[PDB]
PDB file of C-alpha atoms in Angstrom:
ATOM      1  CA  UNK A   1      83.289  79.768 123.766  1.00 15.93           C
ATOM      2  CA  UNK A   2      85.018  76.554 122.231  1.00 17.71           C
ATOM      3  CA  UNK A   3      85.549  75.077 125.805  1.00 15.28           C
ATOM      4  CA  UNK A   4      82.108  75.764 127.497  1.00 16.09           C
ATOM      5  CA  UNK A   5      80.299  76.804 124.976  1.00 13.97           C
ATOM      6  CA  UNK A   6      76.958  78.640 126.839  1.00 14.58           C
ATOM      7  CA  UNK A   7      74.681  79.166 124.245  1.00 13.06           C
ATOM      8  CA  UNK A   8      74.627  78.461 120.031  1.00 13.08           C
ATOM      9  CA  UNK A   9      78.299  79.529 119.500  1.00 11.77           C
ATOM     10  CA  UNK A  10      78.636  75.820 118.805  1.00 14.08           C
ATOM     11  CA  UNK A  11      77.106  76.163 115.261  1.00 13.20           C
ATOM     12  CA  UNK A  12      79.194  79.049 113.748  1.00 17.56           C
ATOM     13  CA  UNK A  13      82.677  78.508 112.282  1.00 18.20           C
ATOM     14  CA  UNK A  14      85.330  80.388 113.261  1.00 18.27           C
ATOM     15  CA  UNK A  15      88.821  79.811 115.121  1.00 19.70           C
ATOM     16  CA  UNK A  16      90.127  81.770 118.095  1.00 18.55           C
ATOM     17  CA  UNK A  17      93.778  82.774 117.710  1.00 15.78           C
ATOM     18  CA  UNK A  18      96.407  81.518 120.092  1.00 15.28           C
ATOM     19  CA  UNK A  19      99.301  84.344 120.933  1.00 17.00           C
ATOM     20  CA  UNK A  20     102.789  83.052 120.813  1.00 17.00           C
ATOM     21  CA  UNK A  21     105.083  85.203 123.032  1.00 16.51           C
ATOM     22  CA  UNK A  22     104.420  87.655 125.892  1.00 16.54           C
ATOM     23  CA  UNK A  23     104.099  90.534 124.226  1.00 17.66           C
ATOM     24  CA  UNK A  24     101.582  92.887 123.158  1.00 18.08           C
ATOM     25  CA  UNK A  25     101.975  93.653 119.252  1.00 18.19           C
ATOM     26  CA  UNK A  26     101.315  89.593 119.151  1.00 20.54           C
ATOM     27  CA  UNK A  27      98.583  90.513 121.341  1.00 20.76           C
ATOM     28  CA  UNK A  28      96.977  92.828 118.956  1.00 24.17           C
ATOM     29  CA  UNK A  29      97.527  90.883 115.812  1.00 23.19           C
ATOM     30  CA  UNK A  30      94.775  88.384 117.947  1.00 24.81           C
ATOM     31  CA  UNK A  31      92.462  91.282 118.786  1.00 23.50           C
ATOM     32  CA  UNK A  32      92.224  92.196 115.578  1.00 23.98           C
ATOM     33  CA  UNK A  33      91.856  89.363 114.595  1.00 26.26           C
ATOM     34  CA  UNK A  34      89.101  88.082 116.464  1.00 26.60           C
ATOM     35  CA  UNK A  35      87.090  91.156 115.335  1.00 26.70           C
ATOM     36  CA  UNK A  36      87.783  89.545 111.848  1.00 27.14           C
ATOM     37  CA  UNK A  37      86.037  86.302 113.430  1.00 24.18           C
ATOM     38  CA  UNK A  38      83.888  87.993 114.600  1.00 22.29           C
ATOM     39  CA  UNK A  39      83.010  89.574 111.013  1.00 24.04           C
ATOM     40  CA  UNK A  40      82.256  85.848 109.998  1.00 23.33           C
ATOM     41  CA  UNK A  41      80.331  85.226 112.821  1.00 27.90           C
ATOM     42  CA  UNK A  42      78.491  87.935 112.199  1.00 25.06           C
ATOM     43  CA  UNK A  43      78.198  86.695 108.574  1.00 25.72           C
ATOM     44  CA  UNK A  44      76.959  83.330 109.247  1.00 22.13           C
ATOM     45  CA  UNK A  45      74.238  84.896 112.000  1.00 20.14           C
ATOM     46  CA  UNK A  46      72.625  86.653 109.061  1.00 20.97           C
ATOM     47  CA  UNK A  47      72.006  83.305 107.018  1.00 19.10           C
ATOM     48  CA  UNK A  48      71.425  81.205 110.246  1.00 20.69           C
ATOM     49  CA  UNK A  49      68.422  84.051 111.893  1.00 16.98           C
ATOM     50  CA  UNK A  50      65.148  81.335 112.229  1.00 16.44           C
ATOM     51  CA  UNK A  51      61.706  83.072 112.063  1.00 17.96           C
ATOM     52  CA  UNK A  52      60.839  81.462 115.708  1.00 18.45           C
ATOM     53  CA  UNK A  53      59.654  83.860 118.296  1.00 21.43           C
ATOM     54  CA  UNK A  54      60.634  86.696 120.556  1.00 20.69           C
TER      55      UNK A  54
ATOM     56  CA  UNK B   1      50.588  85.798 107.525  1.00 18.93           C
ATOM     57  CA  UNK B   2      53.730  86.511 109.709  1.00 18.27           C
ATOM     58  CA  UNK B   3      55.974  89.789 109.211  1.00 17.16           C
ATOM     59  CA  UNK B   4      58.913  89.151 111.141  1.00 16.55           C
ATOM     60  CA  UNK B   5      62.559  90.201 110.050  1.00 18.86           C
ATOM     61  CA  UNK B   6      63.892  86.761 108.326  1.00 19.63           C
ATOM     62  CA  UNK B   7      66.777  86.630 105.726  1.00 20.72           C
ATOM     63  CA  UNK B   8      65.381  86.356 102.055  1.00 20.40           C
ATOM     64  CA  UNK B   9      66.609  83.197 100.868  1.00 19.74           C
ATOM     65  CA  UNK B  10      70.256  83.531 102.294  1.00 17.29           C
ATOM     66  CA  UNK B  11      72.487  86.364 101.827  1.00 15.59           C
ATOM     67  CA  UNK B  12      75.817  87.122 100.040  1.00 13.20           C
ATOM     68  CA  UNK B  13      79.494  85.945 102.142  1.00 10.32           C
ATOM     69  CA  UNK B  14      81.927  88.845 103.414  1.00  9.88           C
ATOM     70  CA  UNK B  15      85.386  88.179 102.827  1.00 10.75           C
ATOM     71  CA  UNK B  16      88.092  87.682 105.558  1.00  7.99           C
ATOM     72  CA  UNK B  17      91.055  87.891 104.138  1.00  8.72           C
ATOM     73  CA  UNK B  18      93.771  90.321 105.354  1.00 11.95           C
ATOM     74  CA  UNK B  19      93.686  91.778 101.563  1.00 12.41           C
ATOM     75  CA  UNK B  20      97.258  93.167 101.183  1.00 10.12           C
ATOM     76  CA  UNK B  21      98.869  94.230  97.747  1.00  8.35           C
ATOM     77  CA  UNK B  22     102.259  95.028  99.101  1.00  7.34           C
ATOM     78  CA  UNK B  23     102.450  97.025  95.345  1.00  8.03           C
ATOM     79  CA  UNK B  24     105.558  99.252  94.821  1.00  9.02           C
ATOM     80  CA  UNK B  25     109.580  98.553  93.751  1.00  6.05           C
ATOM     81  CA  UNK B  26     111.621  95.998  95.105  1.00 11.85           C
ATOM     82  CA  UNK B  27     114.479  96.002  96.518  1.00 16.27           C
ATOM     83  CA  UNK B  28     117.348  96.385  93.635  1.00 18.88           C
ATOM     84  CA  UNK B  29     114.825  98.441  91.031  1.00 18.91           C
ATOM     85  CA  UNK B  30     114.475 101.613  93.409  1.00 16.45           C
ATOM     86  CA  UNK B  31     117.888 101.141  94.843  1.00 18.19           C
ATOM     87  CA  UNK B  32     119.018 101.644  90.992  1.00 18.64           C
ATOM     88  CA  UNK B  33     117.158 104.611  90.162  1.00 18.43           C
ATOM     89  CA  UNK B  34     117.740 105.864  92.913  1.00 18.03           C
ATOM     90  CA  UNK B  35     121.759 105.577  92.590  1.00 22.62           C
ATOM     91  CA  UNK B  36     121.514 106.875  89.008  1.00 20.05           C
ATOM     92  CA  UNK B  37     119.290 110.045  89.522  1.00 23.32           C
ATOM     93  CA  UNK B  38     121.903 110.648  91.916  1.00 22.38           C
ATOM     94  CA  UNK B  39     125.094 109.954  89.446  1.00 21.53           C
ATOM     95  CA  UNK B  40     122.944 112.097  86.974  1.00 24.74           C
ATOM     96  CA  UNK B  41     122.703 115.133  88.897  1.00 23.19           C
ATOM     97  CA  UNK B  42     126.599 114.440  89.691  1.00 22.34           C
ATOM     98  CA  UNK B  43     127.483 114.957  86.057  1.00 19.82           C
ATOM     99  CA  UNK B  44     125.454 117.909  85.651  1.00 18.92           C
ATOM    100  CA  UNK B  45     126.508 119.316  88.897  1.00 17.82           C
ATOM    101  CA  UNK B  46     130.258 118.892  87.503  1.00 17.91           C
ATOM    102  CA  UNK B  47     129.239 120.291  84.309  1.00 18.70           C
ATOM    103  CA  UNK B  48     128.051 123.826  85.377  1.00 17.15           C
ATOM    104  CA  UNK B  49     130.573 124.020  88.371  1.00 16.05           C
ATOM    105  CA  UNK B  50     133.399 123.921  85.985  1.00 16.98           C
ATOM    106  CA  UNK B  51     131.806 126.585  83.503  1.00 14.15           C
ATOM    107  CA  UNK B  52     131.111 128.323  86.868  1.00 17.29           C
ATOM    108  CA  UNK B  53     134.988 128.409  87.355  1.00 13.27           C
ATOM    109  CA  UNK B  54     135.706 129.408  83.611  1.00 11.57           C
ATOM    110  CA  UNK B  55     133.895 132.660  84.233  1.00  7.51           C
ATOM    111  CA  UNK B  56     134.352 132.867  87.500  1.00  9.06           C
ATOM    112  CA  UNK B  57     138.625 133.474  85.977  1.00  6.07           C
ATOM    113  CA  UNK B  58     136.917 136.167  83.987  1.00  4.81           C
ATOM    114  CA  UNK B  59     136.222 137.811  86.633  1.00  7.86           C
ATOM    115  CA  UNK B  60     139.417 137.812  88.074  1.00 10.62           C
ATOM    116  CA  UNK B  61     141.298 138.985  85.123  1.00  9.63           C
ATOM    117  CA  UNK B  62     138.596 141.997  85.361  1.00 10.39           C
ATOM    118  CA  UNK B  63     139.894 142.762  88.492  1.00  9.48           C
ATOM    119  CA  UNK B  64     143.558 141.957  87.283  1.00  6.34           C
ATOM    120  CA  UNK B  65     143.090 144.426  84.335  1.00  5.77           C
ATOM    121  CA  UNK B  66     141.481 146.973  86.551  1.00  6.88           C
ATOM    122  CA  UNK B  67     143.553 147.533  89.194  1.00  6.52           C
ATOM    123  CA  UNK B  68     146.639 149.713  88.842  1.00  4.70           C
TER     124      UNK B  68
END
């Protein structure tokens, strides 16, 4: 998303978190929280929603 | 007129804050009460075994007086 970014995802704010050892509580502390970012996301899709077209 | 689904005006923000209140004792104030309940029920504990062993004596000497 933040190196190819495909579609719009470059006008939301949010950060992607990096893990720091091979493990996989570390790795659940970043899946939760990039459901989190994905809360704001979310959040920022609601005020950004254009009335364009279908 | 258009009737689409649009936001009306802009909408409220939902937080994202990992909202902890780690509430409760610390570290010292429960290990305290916790060591002086405990000394408490000591000195009680001493209290009524020591009465126990007064009549428990009694009940000795009943046997004592009883036997022959």
């Amino acid at each position: 998303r933040k190196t190819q970014p495909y579609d719009v995802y470059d006008q939301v704010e949010f950060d992607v978190p990096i893990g720091s050892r091979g493990d996989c509580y570390d790795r659940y502390l970043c899946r939760v929280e990039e459901m989190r970012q994905s809360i704001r996301i979310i959040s920022q899709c609601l005020n950004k929603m254009p009335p364009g077209e279908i | 007129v258009k009737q689409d689904m649009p936001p009306v005006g802009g909408y409220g923000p939902i937080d994202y804050k990992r909202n902890l209140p780690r509430r409760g004792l610390s570290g010292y104030s429960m290990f305290a009460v916790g060591i002086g309940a405990l000394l408490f029920g000591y000195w009680s504990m001493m209290r009524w075994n020591r009465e126990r062993r007064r009549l428990q004596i009694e009940d000795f000497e009943a046997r004592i007086a009883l036997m022959p």
